[PDB]
């Protein structure tokens, strides 16, 4: 009915599929633009069975993009790091169409306009800033989402719950704080703020108070949940830093990200600004799945590990 029509790019991606599912769950007409040569045919069918309108094509099809933009109201991009600047193709279509009410570029991580990282990762977030600068210069309505750490992804990466090993790797001292949110919630809240006036032309950060922790505390809580103790093996910062200088690309990128998130503590190294919007405060009918609840999920029905593209 009055629900805004949502167009999603990168819908078959790691975080993108949660935005597609969240959009549909919220009753929004959902358009999913995806490549003709899809290896995610089983994910697309699911989207379709849920009500999504699948649109096959390439980002290079400018005319197709423009005609598509004219049919929707909101555009959300969840493209991967290798395609950050390709979002300029999406932006060009938005500019020509002229009817888009809100554009959310592919951020969904650290708040790049207030943090810096090691060269490997800095080059990537600088590309994300370029997109933001282009959006602002064109006066395109937007929302910049800083979703912080993807919880299932990093619980898998840090705790390796599927690994019966007796040791656990700690990056740096392990004392740096970070915030991590459940992917399903990131998807749901993202759709909500994309149509929320309180988020128009603002930076929205997902930092629920129940999802802030350090590597050491996460380990301790996991140990209590499963009744096992692990031998902690640390990886010195100077060591991680060196690797980002010697290892090739994209190898050194994950290492740079690990330093940013778990050593520098970039997701918790700042205080909120006047115009910042912290998402957990927006909806009294919803709440972010907490860290304890997340650990319970991994104990009862843990999700498969994943690896972002670089």
From Swiss-Prot:
Pathway given for this chain reads: Aromatic compound metabolism; phenylpropanoid biosynthesis
One Pfam family from the record: NmrA
Q: Where is this site: Required for activity?
A: 257
**What biological-process terms (Gene Ontology) are attached?**
eugenol biosynthetic process
What EC numbers are recorded for this enzyme? Answer: 1.1.1.318
Q: In which tissues is it expressed?
A: Trichome glands.
Regulation of activity: what does the record state?
A: Inhibited by zinc and copper ions. Repressed by 4-bromo-cinnamyl acetate. Desactivated by the competitive inhibitor EMDF ((7S,8S)-ethyl(7,8-methylene)-dihydroferulate).
**Entries under InterPro entries matching the protein:** NAD(P)-bd_dom_sf, NmrA-like, NmrA-type/Isoflavone_red_sf, PCBER-like
Swiss-Prot/TrEMBL keywords: NADP, Nucleotide-binding, Oxidoreductase, Phenylpropanoid metabolism
* Signal peptide extent: none
Q: What class of enzyme is it?
A: oxidoreductase
UniProt binding sites for substrate: 110, 254
The record lists the effect of residue 310 to Y as: Normal activity
Q: Indicate the annotated site residue(s) for Confers substrate specificity.
A: 81, 84
Q: Which SUPFAM superfamilies match?
A: NAD(P)-binding Rossmann-fold domains (SSF51735)
Q: How does activity depend on pH?
A: Optimum pH is 6.5.
Give the recorded effect for residue 84 to Y: Confers some isoeugenol synthase activity
Task: Return the similarity comment.
Answer: Belongs to the NmrA-type oxidoreductase family.
Summarize subunit and interaction data from the UniProt record for this chain: Homodimer.
Q: What is this protein called?
A: Eugenol synthase 1
Organism listed in the record:
Ocimum basilicum (Sweet basil)
